[PDB]
């Protein structure tokens, strides 16, 4: 809708950020890929890909490269792939009706390179 989740986080974390609360129907499985988190080069949770053959795609709106932070109301800003990945799963697994994914906004651009890498 208009407003969503915006408090669980810190004031020095969001910083008048632009986050939304998307709700996906728990129909046709989840089928979602994640990448980053843990000690990754990302340092956050970003949708790896939205399986066209899942409930993720069905919804639409957001796509890979997103900025996942909370899952059904579960701070994953410091969560690991597995943790998050699994976590999210658990939710869907539960067999609910819908799932509220808390992910920030971010258009598909892709551009990050600044390190001679040893």
| Domain range annotation of the chain | 1-118
CA atoms of 92 and 99, how far apart (whole Å):
7
The answer to whether the beta carbons of residues 6 and 104 sit under 8 Å apart is no
CB 55 within 8 A of CB 26: yes
Beta-carbon contacts of residue 118 (< 8 Å; ≥ 6 apart) = none
- Burial class (CB within 10 angstroms; exposed 0-12, middle 13-18, buried 19+) of 88: buried
Fold classified for 1-118: Pdz3 Domain (2.30.42)
In this structure, are residues 65 and 47 in contact, taking their beta carbons and an 8 Å threshold?
yes
Query: Max alpha carbon distance in the chain (Å)?
Result: 49
Tell the residue number behind the tokens 């609910």, with chain if given: 96
d(CA 48, CA 6): 24
- Strands (E) across the chain are located at 19-25, 33-36, 45-49, 67-71, 98-104
The strands making up 98-104's β-sheet, listed across from edge to edge, are 19-25, 98-104, 67-71, 45-49, 33-36
The Cα 23–Cα 1 span in angstroms is 9
Length of the chain: 118
Helix, coil or strand: residue 55: helix
Closest among 79, 77, 80, 83 to 104, alpha carbons compared: 77
């Amino acid at each position: 809708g208009s407003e969503g989740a915006a408090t669980m986080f810190s004031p020095e974390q969001i910083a008048g950020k632009d986050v939304r609360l998307l709700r996906i129907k728990k129909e046709g499985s989840l089928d979602l890929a994640l990448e980053g988190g843990v000690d990754s080069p990302v340092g956050k949770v970003v949708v790896s890909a939205v399986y066209e053959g899942g409930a993720a795609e069905r919804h639409g709106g957001v796509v890979k490269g997103d900025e996942i932070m909370a899952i059904n109301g579960k701070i994953v800003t410091d969560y690991t792939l597995a943790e998050a990945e699994a976590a999210l799963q658990k939710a869907w697994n539960q067999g609910g009706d819908w799932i509220d994914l808390v992910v920030a906004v971010c258009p598909p651009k892709e551009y990050d390179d600044e390190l001679t890498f040893f």
